[PDB]
Design a protein around this ligand. Structure first.
Ligand SMILES: [Zn+2]
Ligand SMILES: [Zn+2]
Lengths: 90, 90
């Protein structure tokens, strides 16, 4: 049933990511989506779903750094580091 | 049905906060619980349930400041600022 929970979380993430991408709905909404899905998958406790989340969060971090938002970058980097440490300890 | 989702989120928050206060857990599990509940309440559409979370997160940040962790206080402060801005815009 853990696999079913991971599948539901990933389906929600995919649908929300697709809807956000075919729009212009700011970087903050995308970061909130990533953080929500990351916390859900951390309460589930499965790897191989947090590593792709980490890679996509690095993509978002690059996008934010190329822009002019210095307060969103610190939250993105803190989330990335925390998820990396949790993956290492998981 | 919005109120029912808010009630479910608050029920999960209360139960897990009771658990984490009972079994002497780390200061990171509490922050992860707060972030999870805050993101869920931000996603629905609720205020007047996000100000109590702001109060409790301010108390948790006060606890973190006098603990000895500096890379954990930045995440809490960033979350407080983002939730406060979203409350203002909501
Ligand atoms: Zn953590
Ligand atoms: Zn935000």
């Amino acid at each position: 049933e853990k696999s079913l929970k991971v599948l539901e979380a990933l389906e929600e993430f995919f649908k929300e990511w697709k809807r956000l991408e075919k729009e212009g709905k700011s970087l903050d909404e995308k970061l909130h989506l990533f953080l929500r899905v990351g916390e859900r998958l951390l309460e589930i406790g499965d790897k191989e779903s947090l590593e792709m989340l980490i890679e996509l969060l690095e993509e978002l971090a690059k996008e934010i750094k190329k822009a002019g938002n210095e307060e969103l970058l610190v939250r993105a980097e803190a989330a990335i580091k925390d998820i990396r440490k949790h993956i290492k300890e998981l």
